[PDB]
Nucleic acid binder design. Structure first.
Ligand SMILES: [Mg+2]
Length: 835
RNA sequence: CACCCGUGCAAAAAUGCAGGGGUCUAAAACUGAGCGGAUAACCUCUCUAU
RNA sequence: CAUAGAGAGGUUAUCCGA
């Protein structure tokens, strides 16, 4: 169940000096101060419209009782007594990595004797983590077409300086320029059309490649983003993301050109596309002015302002209109627009008059301790919503049902348009460089990744804004240092990101390149009259083909489709009803038997199977097989990439905390030579002649750098794993994770697997096979040899090897546990702890 | 069935009960979002064809 | 500038399994 304190209305508890402050939830992700306690002495802020009242206040915590919605009473622990019980004074808590003073001194001027700034700093760190992961994914997608260049690319040089490599007398950069030249002109550049292709007029319009300057600028921006996020830059370059206004003119121009296209393609046709909707709404909103109504419609549909009010308008409308038989065939043709107008009416009803009703609904939602209440309150609200808006819904339905009158209302243009355009999407000349760079980064990833990245950024920026508002209200110092003053405008950035969330979609395949992708689509199934044209047409339009090609070589995907255990596991993840539907679509008998038959059929898909009695039967069968194959391989590849993202997070965190600990005064040494120097430095052990001679002692655990390694058992376990690791193996693992070499070489690394129990096991088997292949002709330590022999003998990933080469993350115990023991890696598959 | 912290109780150096964690792990609450298919209208540029 | 028929893209629903 969820936290009862959060449901009671307690947002957070902040320790400032010897006093403590308790906040409350507000409109959206806002915070309101109402309670200050100084050693069992309570003073109430927010004298009017309170959120909760504290019953008993003690040094050990505070018991509170809420007033919003359900009167749920809970208890909250005192932050000033953290780490100070049964072992004897009040002190401001520190982060578990013992890096709070260093982070405060870095992002701000000095230490602040409170636990508010550190949360903002950790939100910034989360922003950097997610940016690192998705920039690494984008770089891998851009590099996959090769079937070095993207590592040394920096924005300090423009295309004019890069062009001097034509006559360069040194081969080191001549090879780089040759690689750049080979990059352009590649047919695989047809993907990512919005990043490399632009529309051109006939003197009809066709998509053509941009000039070399713009392509180089895009590549440089992406490469520098990856280099800055993944690595720990030193000097001015470490502020590259937060000083994007200092970029050269070429990069700004390419960012503006990339960003302006969707905006100019969305707000230009807004009036014409939704004409009938505004006409009907004006008919039913007789009193409201037309300009204000169209402004509200634009803010509701294009900007999608109905997805951040706290509740779900869609759920309320669904639970309201279900009673009346609008789901019947009678309104089948008009359902699409009628429902949209219903949600619009609901939205304008909750922002003009029923603001208090919306606040009550969101309060009841927040105070619920389970899922049963979250539906009962929705139904209760929907009853009143029906009883109030039945007439308006009926009027809209009858107006839309008049297809004759609908056509009569479509050919007449009387809308005021050149006035009140301030609601339109801001062009590239008004948005910040950070948002444009984020959009350019998103132009290289799949839609789910885009949604995850944008939502995470919006949430973190909202967190930063709320914390800044809290600090301003409390009177605390919040002036960032001169290098991070960008974050002072964070609120504005949040808006842009929210605005960016309105219209950002996946990338579009170029229309003219529909023939160049014929070979890739025809070869992803490994085929090689005119039936192959049908197969290519039915493969290209699949949404999973984009992911399968942008993130994998089609021939390699076809080769890895022969791994029967892997495909069998992916089919096992699919529920029984879906498997039955697939079998009935692909063929004219238990669930497991049908799953095995499907896994056998997909493994040797051939041209004979497609060719081989109605034309409306064999065509659907071939389509079903094609779509099933594409779905299976897409799921496998996507989950493998998502698993690799976690280790990308881990290595970025390792680099960042290495730099932070080195700044904090800990002798960590260089990290490029050995990636596990953080863990030894935190423990305090040294590589005496290449091995850790020191054994376990309780004193070493008692004097660890951070609270993570202050438990004797986990200290001993991680030290033992360290003594069983190898520097070269760790470096190769880091390179494989950062460059996604395991996923790229999936053809070979999956050849001789026996059984797959989860995606974690498959990914680590791939990595272990890659490590064995790279070290097949090199001298390795006895532990690595034992691990490789065990992997070869069992033909399954070795968990001890995972514990061995994941030791660089050992300084963070929770991350190490999550990334080593299977069953704790994925939150969607909660397993059992093996240790 | 993760990690850390608080409090009661058994102990004697750890078990249990009940909680908290934005300052632990992709990871605070409402919501936005991170799951997969199989059909539907409606708009735009046509492009022979009416 | 009506009906047949293609592509290619916008939003939007509703249906079952989680
Ligand atoms: Mg966090």
């Amino acid at each position: 169940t969820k936290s009862m304190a959060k449901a009671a209305g307690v947002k957070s508890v902040f320790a400032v000096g010897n006093t403590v402050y308790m906040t409350s939830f507000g409109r959206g992700n806002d915070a309101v101060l109402e309670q200050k306690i100084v050693d069992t002495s309570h003073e109430p802020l927010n004298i009017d419209d309170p959120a909760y009242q504290l019953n008993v206040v003690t040094m050990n915590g505070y018991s509170v009782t809420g007033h919003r919605g359900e009167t749920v009473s809970a208890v909250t622990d005192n932050p000033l007594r953290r780490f100070n019980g049964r072992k004897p004074e009040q002190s401001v808590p520190t982060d578990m990595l013992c890096l709070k003073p260093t982070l405060e001194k870095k992002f701000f001027g000095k230490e602040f004797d409170d636990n508010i700034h550190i949360q903002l700093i950790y939100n910034i760190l989360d922003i950097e983590k997610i940016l690192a992961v998705y920039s690494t994914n984008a770089i891998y997608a851009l590099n996959n077409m090769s079937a070095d260049f993207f590592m040394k690319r920096t924005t300090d040089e423009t295309f004019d300086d890069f062009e001097k490599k034509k006559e360069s007398t040194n081969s080191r950069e001549k090879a780089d320029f040759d690689a750049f030249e080979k990059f352009i002109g590649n047919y695989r550049l047809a993907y990512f059309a919005d990043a490399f292709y632009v529309n051109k007029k006939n003197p009809k319009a066709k998509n053509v490649l941009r000039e070399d300057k713009e392509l180089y600028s895009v590549l440089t921006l992406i490469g520098k983003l990856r280099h800055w996020c993944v690595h720990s830059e030193e000097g001015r370059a470490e502020f590259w993301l937060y000083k994007l206004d200092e970029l050269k003119d070429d990069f700004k121009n390419v960012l503006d050109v990339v960003y302006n296209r969707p905006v100019e393609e969305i707000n230009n046709r807004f009036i014409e596309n939704n004409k009938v909707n505004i006409q009907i709404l004006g008919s039913v909103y007789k009193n409201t002015d037309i300009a204000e109504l169209v402004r509200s419609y634009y803010e509701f549909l294009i900007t999608k302002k109905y997805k951040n009010m706290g509740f779900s308008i869609k759920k309320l409308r669904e639970s309201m209109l279900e009673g009346k038989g609008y789901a019947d065939k009678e309104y089948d043709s008009v359902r699409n627009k009628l429902y949209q107008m219903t949600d619009f009416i609901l939205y304008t009803g909750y922002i003009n008059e029923d603001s208090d009703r919306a606040d009550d609904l969101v309060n009841t939602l927040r105070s619920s301790l389970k899922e049963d209440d979250k539906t009962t309150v929705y139904c209760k609200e929907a009853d009143y919503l029906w009883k109030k808006y039945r007439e308006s819904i009926r009027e809209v339905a009858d107006a839309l049902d008049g297809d004759n009158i609908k056509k009569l209302s479509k050919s007449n243009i009387e809308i005021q348009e050149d006035k009140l355009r301030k609601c339109f999407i801001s062009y590239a000349d008004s948005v910040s460089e950070f948002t444009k760079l984020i959009y350019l980064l998103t132009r290289f990833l799949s839609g789910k990744e885009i949604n995850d990245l944008v939502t995470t950024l919006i949430n973190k920026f909202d967190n930063i804004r709320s914390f800044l508002e809290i600090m301003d209200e409390l009177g605390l110092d919040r002036t960032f240092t001169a290098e991070y003053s960008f974050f002072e405008g964070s609120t504005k950035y949040l808006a842009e990101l929210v605005e960016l969330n309105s219209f950002v979609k996946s990338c579009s395949f170029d229309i003219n390149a529909k023939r160049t992708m014929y070979r890739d689509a025809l070869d992803i199934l490994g085929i090689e009259n005119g039936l192959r044209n049908f197969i290519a047409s039915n493969v290209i339009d699949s949404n999973r083909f984009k992911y399968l090609v942008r993130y994998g070589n089609p021939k390699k995907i076809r080769e890895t489709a022969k791994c029967k255990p892997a495909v069998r596991f992916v089919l096992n993840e699919i529920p029984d009803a879906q498997i039955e539907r697939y079998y009935e679509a692909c063929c004219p008998c238990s669930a497991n038997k049908r799953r095995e038959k499907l896994a056998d059929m997909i493994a040797e898909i051939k041209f004979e199977n497609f060719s081989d009695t109605s034309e409306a039967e064999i065509k659907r069968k071939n389509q079903a097989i094609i779509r099933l194959y594409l779905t299976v391989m897409y799921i496998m590849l996507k989950n493998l990439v998502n698993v690799n993202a976690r280790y990308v997070i881990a290595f970025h965190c390792v680099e960042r905390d290495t730099k932070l600990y080195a700044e904090s005064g800990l002798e960590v040494g260089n990290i490029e030579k050995n990636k596990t120097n953080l863990t030894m430095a935190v423990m305090g052990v040294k590589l005496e002649n290449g091995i850790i001679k020191t054994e376990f002692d309780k004193s070493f655990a008692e004097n660890a750098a951070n609270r993570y390694l202050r438990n004797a058992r986990w200290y001993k376990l991680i030290l033992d794993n360290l003594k069983k690791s190898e520097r070269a193996v760790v470096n190769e693992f880091r390179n494989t994770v950062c460059h996604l070499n395991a996923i790229r070489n999936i053809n070979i690394n999956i050849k001789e697997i026996k059984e797959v129990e989860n995606y974690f096991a498959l990914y680590h088997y791939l990595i272990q096979k890659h490590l064995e292949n790279r070290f097949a002709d090199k001298k390795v330590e006895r532990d690595t040899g034992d691990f490789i022999s065990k992997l070869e003998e069992h033909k399954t990933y070795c968990k001890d090897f995972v514990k061995a080469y994941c030791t660089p993350f050992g300084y963070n115990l929770v991350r190490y546990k999550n990334l080593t023991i299977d069953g704790l890696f994925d939150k969607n598959y909660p397993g059992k702890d093996d240790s």
